[PDB]
Amino acid sequence: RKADLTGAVSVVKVDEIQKQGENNPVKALQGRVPGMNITADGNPSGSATVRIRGIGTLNNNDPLYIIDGVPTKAGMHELNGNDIESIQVLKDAASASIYGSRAANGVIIITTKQGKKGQIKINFDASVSASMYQSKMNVLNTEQYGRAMWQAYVNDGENPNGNALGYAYNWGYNADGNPVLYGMTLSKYLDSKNTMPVADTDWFDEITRTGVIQQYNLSVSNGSEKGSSFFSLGYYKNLGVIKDTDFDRFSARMNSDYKLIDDILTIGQHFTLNRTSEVQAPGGIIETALDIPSAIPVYASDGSWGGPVGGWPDRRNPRAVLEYNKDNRYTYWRMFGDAYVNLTPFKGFNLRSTFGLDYANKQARYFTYPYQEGTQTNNGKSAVEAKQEHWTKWMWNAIATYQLEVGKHRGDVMIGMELNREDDSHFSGYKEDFSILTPDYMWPDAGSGTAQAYGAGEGYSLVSFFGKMNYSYADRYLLSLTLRRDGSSRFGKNHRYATFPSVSLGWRITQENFMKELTWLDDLKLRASWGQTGNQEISNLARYTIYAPNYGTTDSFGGQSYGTAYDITGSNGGGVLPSGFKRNQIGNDNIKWETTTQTNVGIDFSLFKQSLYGSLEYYYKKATDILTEMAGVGVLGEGGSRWINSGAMKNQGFEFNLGYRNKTAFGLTYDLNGNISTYRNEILELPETVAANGKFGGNGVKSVVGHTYGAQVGYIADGIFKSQDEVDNHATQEGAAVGRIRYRDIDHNGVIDERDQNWIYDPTPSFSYGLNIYLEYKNFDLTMFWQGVQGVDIISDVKKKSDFWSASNVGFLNKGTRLLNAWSPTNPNSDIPALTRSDTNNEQRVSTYFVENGSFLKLRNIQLGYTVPAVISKKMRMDRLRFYCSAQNLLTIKSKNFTGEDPENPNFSYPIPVNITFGLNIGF
Amino acid sequence: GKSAVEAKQEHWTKWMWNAIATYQLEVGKHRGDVMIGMELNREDDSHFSGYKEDFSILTPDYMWPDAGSGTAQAYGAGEGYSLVSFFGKMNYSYADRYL
Amino acid sequence: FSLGYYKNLGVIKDTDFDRFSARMNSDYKLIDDILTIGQHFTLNRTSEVQ
Amino acid sequence: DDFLDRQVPQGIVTGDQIASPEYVDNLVISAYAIWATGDDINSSFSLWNYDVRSDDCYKGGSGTEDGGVFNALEISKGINTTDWNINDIWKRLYQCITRANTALQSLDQMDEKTYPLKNQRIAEMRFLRGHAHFMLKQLFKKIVIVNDENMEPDAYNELSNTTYTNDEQWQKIADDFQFAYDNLPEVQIEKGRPAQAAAAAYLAKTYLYKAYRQDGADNALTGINEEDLKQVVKYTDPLIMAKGGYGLETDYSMNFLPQYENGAESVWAIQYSINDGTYNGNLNWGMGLTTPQILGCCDFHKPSQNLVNAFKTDSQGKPLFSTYDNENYEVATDNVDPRLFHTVGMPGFPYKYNEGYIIQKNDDWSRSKGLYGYYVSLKENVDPDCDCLKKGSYWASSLNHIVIRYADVLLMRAEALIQLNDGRITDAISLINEVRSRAAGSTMLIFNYKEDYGVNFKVTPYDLKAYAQDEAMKMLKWERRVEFGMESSRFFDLVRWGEAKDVINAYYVTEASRCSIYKNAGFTENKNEYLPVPFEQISASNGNYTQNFGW
């Protein structure tokens, strides 16, 4: 039963959601909803990014979740997802407008479990899983690194023995004169102090482990003709594949409802309290592991952490970084409550008053230990940073609803007044100069150095007056009209309030009397909708010209702190310097709501007595007056960025969902749920400065207007040179040589320059599809979910560090294994450019070489279960006893054009492991 | 002319786990209750504060540690304790007269 | 299920104390008399100027 | 309905309150802080990153890829208008300009009687704005002259770099310096604030740069203006400098030592401080990359062998005008100017006058494994045991960056007198002799080298007699080269003199043997003497910004 019945609403089967055994319920439905993309890195937490109906605005695109009627935007990884009874995604503006003023990016409606009338249920779910690291990037070992360095040296024509890295090469020339390597030897110690012995270290294996996931849920549900209740407890723990990274969560939910008199005075509440403790991986840990050469030992001769010495590249020890980061644990208390009262003066009138609260409290204590890894050190700096953050949101809602059933005319009239009110704050203390260097001793009182205090606060409010009218004739013609008047504190008084209408029409064709002979066609419905929604998800301080006293106490990398503190006297400090103010942004009093107009046309069908069901949707979204933060013109200086309504986005999309469930003669019940979706995104208008800086695409070379959001312009790589004749015949370019990348001459001017660039990257897949298969046979249930993406291109940064030598900022870094298969006179059958120590050709430029085909098809979740026969369970007094074994991310298929691995995560983000899970469910 | 802000945060977290085994008997006029119990109590407290000076507008809206321009101080401490208990209780009643 | 609001302005000026409170208690009996699972929770928010 | 109106900005000041009279002084301090906190490692206000194009130094780091854009600038090949460093330095300099403009706008709306120091503060702010404009003009020939503090932001889109010609832009830059000279006090109790002497010296420098006319579409010298040279001579008079108590230091090294900050020769410097309530202190983060490998990382700003050979002198104490670069300098058999050991740290010698650190030709002092040599710049570096050096993810010190030195004033006066050729060459010769005499006596920390490393010092002043204009100009060029090495002014001087192309080509040819990075280097006659206008800025302001000639 859809909550709108006349809009683009997707109902997710919650039973299949819990099968995947994911902490985040949103991550579970990664590819089960058409036109809704979920991207998850693979960290122990269930944090993921959601994009509904593509990219719809130049602002925050997270959809508005609704739990028990209370809206929010925080991720669901911090809430217990095992007590959800229904999930509905409202991807249509007309249908989702009535649920809030933040519905521009879509609304996901989540309903929690409630006690079923007249019965009691208890469910205990246990789950133990092992997560294994699968996407192991192949990097050069010691011998391979030496061979690659020798190849680069001989290709450049330099002496390979001058590497000054302890490698001594015995080599010569063949009959054709091409250099050949006979053998290599290494010095025992990398430094003259004999403190860093040479070793063959697998850094990826050193920093990875086999994670353990535990999940225990216990829920009890109570129903009656007269009231109901529900109490759930949950514990989740996930150890990541990366060492010293973990995430655990305790959860307790209590829901209840009471009916007084006979039917009047229905008072209900839903509350949940969660406590999540997490240690996250340091930024660029995978990059650090990939960059550091395998010759560096984990431990030095004296037992301290190993590190680069002499001429080895400056990279920290990833194991040491993980060890020092294991104490950066943060605790997060989440609190989602709601209490509502419903009054019924007579049969058709309802008055609902609702109060919802969301309180979040985050406490963290970060430590900075002194480290000395060879030549890598922080000058013995030890510090503590105690940070506290508070978020407090509350919403009050009043709803008046009237229903009439006059003849064949059904009429629902609803009005509503809503207030939303959010306040955020944070403050932190910073201390230095510690002695014991242990988390027990590192407290700000125990410090003996410079101290810093940081602190800020913000907030906003929203007011909404909405109305909804639904008319039904003969249960065949449906009309819906909703109107919203929304105001926010982020806008000035003149442009505070805005009006948004939406209309929906629906015709149940099967109800018409002219096709009663079509017995096979069980149900057919055609619906259309045209709606407008408002977007105001911008910075709270958007219309003010901000001047802030930035003294410079905040840590900055590179010294570009832009602080306001100058030693005007010239005494080299020694006290409190005079300070001032700096401009952060220029105010704009003409900012108003961004208007997103959505037109949707859908056809729902069901054939063969509800056996073959499905839906087909086509949508057109047009966002105008987009509140974008334009940067300064360049001579406007600091604080030149300002918010302006100068945007325009278009999204044209198709979605198709199908489902076929049927039994078999010998007792097999098969259910197939297929889904496919495609969309095209375009930017029609954009501010000149925004298009110039290329923050939304174009790389600052060409304007992204008229092209897909995020599209990138680069050169075109027409293979590599294989002879001097090819270099001479090709158009002249700097650094052209044998074995170097050849770049196409777009304008045919005879010279390769910055004007020889074109659109090369389009981050829009041709189509994304999913398929769920459920088989039941003799108490055996098998679930198999496949997700595929076709026609998507990806920019690969790992390729830049695997197909080239000395293509990074610093040289002598560790590279990929496939680098060994580079072009050479001895090995002409290769497309990888020849190794070189100098990037004369400038191959780090954006080009089609780094663009790879990201199409993939992976088995997201497979599960085989066994249900104990009812007689044995009744003997053991359990109403339902089930066991199951599942595999998540077990298998994947990728295109041959993708040189790397894991097309879903082709970069240095958190890896996605393979989960092998065993679980049991008891229904006492 | 001293102006300053002091942002203080304190956390207290206590949890107790209890296990009780109770048996009751009603043999004739003899009533007997035997109870055993194992209890764990576990308390952790912490606090930290930041101190800033040299403010200009001198209003609560403007007084935040980031808006200060003077000497800053950081204070912080933590503590905790645990308790373990094994207890037993026996109640005997004769004729509902002798306890 | 109980909700409560209290506010007290002291006789001394600029001193006050307010408190919001929400309590939810429940108990459930399974089978016939075995497996009695219960809970009592209360959440309070007190804002005070002393 | 007060539901949406209770809430106000937290911890910030709105734009309508920044004009209050009690904040203006704060804003003034802001205009100075941007000169010490607004520079990154890759974009410093000393402009050493863009001085690698000259013959004084290479680019440090692990290799060419470490700052590929800067390597392309150094070799003058493969330079694209869509480079991040050019746009970054443009944006940072204009950020300084607009901070100064905001302070000026705040100052201009205040009563003179209530605020007696209004004129002095306005003069200081004009001086800072003119300094930023001058550095932009040096980097880019065509710049936008933002000299209107009372300009609305919406009008900033209507500005253009072709509104004024080159001469008009130079005059607009010099107007601020003229106002500052007319309004600044003779002596400043606070060393951070510029004095009248600094304004006069910088105005003379601006007029000297204006003298070498760059009329026409191309960047070729089209003549020397006599009026500009007369103005230079007028504004460089020794009476003005002596009125402010400025003069050459007794020892050269005191210009680059923490113990002698804000000295007599320090006409105006950026005040860098440590232990001042900041997270790491207002250190010179722009020079953080320049620290040697012994200090830990990045080994940038390595002086070239050409400069070391230039420091070599003959038996008569004069620089080798034609045979200096034929052979590498030898410590045992070649007389050397003492200024070399205060500028370049050669292997086998103490590092920053510290006997405990000896520079060696190994990986402990070179990051590129000999690709960029083993020489270490010393002017911006400090002793490792200074206690003025702090590790803030980049080794930076509190040593002041001296923008204007009295030796610079003397050399500009000598150059103006030589170019005038109005029977006053002997005064320029006397100034050069004074500079050389100051250099000769600068052996208070390197005196023992003669008895420790066999170093022969031989510097003598030129004889006072009649000199031809070309010979005197050559001697002035040599004195400038040997006096302001590592100080990031060689390329600008070459561009101003109009001989940048020939000198750069000769340097490339000579150093291609000892440095492979110059294998394919090449300098264009009318394209590589000025940084191109960033492509992002031109795209942002369509039909208003014109690219420099040759692009």
Ligand SMILES: OC[C@H]1O[C@@](CO)(OC[C@H]2O[C@@](CO)(OC[C@H]3O[C@@](CO)(OC[C@H]4O[C@@](CO[C@]5(CO)O[C@H](CO)[C@@H](O)[C@@H]5O)(OC[C@H]5O[C@@](CO)(OC[C@H]6O[C@](O)(CO)[C@@H](O)[C@@H]6O)[C@@H](O)[C@@H]5O)[C@@H](O)[C@@H]4O)[C@@H](O)[C@@H]3O)[C@@H](O)[C@@H]2O)[C@@H](O)[C@@H]1O
């Ligand atoms: O802005 C648009 C466009 O510009 C890009 C294009 O590259 O960068 C420019 C942008 O980046 C900055 C950062 O402030 O400059 C980077 C730029 O500077 C160069 C030289 O030109 O390198 C400078 C040196 O910095 C080092 C120093 O590394 C360490 C780490 O702290 O410092 C200490 C010494 O005190 C040493 O012990 C350490 O090695 O590296 C910093 C540089 O390294 C980067 C770049 O890949 O990543 C390396 C990180 O990987 C880790 O493993 C994970 O943390 C770490 O070990 C390491 O930090 C990046 O994080 C840092 O910027 C040293 O290696 C260099 O010699 C160039 O190499 C570099 O390109 C800005 O100045 C400038 O605006 C992009 O940002 C963007 O597309």
Ligand SMILES: OC[C@H]1O[C@@](CO)(OC[C@H]2O[C@@](CO)(OC[C@H]3O[C@@](CO)(OC[C@H]4O[C@](O)(CO)[C@@H](O)[C@@H]4O)[C@@H](O)[C@@H]3O)[C@@H](O)[C@@H]2O)[C@@H](O)[C@@H]1O
């Ligand atoms: O991130 C910018 C923006 O986020 C806000 C608004 O909630 O708060 C986020 C703060 O969390 C910070 C570090 O403290 O990073 C986020 C990490 O903290 C976690 C903890 O669960 O997330 C907190 C917060 O972000 C979501 O996860 C986003 O959906 C929400 O579910 C949750 O409420 C964790 O998920 C992240 O790793 C940092 O970004 C912010 O301080 C604002 O404070 C801030 O403006």
Ligand SMILES: [Mg+2]
């Ligand atoms: Mg071309």
Ligand SMILES: [Mg+2]
């Ligand atoms: Mg100083």
